[PDB]
């Protein structure tokens, strides 16, 4: 159980963009 960890942390980047884009999409669309 070492590789799985590498992914568990990767989420930190996924969630970041997941939220950063969630606003950019709604904003850019409805400025």
Curated annotation (Swiss-Prot):
The gene is VGF. The chain holds residues 586 to 615 of 615 of the full protein. This is VGF-derived peptide TLQP-62. Plays a role in the regulation of memory formation and depression-related behaviors potentially by influencing synaptic plasticity and neurogenesis. Induces acute and transient activation of the NTRK2/TRKB receptor and subsequent CREB phosphorylation. Also induces insulin secretion in insulinoma cells by increasing intracellular calcium mobilization. It comes from the Eukaryota. Residues 2-15 have a biased composition (Basic and acidic residues).
């Amino acid at each position: 159980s070492a590789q799985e960890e590498a992914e568990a942390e990767e989420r930190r980047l996924q969630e970041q963009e997941e939220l950063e884009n969630y606003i950019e999409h709604v904003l850019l669309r409805r400025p």
